[PDB]
Amino acid sequence: MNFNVGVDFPSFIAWDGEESFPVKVDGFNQFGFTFKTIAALTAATTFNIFYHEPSDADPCVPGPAIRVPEVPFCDTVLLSEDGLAAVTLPETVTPDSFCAGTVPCMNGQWISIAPATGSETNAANVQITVTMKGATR
Amino acid sequence: MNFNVGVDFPSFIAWDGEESFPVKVDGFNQFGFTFKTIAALTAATTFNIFYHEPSDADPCVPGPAIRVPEVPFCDTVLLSEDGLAAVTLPETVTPDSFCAGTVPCMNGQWISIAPATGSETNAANVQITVTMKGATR
């Protein structure tokens, strides 16, 4: 007995190794990423996070790409230099092993991931994906 | 206050529009798909569902691709003329609406989706991902 869990936690693509895809997070109220590697990496891989706004012309297409700021969590220290969120897939992460992170404070209605500059060489071997949690229609 | 919904319902890419991927479903007990189109389709597209088995050379790599049989419940009247489960995205699915579904009985350790013959040039405009549920180990 397995449940049709596509409704009630659907999942969409966010980076297939060649292109980012904005995923709409308005209809839901919780979401997270589930990274996954396809072949051994060369060094640490860093990804930027972006959030979009409803476009000025059409209200159901994403607007431009704005970068989401990052908040501390009562014990932070690293404190990324230009107060802007980023995720770093650590080196020596094998395949058949997934990692799952999530930005705390949501903003906008479309979120997106993009390979940070200087790290788009071995970023074609990662494939980020998103999964939301609970419809609020 | 959104949670790291990644762990506890992770998700992976099963069909990125150009090539398939086998996703391991041993560690979990329940799973389902979340179809999503990127551009308007031209006709009803049909995908085949495949399950793998642990390869004899290495039990952490999928073997060959077998096709999952079809299970009718009571209401089934189509029976797909083949006894081999398959999904079919109907025409008129606008590319801002997802569709969920899953097989009623898993078998093996892996699962895969690939476009059935005839609808191989429309499937380049769709995206299929798999999200699991609670981890057994």
Partner: peptide, 28 residues
């Protein structure tokens, strides 16, 4: 500030020999 939590998917076996004390042998 995102924090990841990875975990493996497939385990590996664990084989190890069980060598025992050897045949008693006199030191002479």
């Amino acid at each position: 500030m995102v924090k990841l939590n990875c975990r493996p998917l497939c385990q590996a076996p664990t084989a190890s020999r069980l060598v025992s004390p050897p045949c008693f042998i006199c030191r002479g």
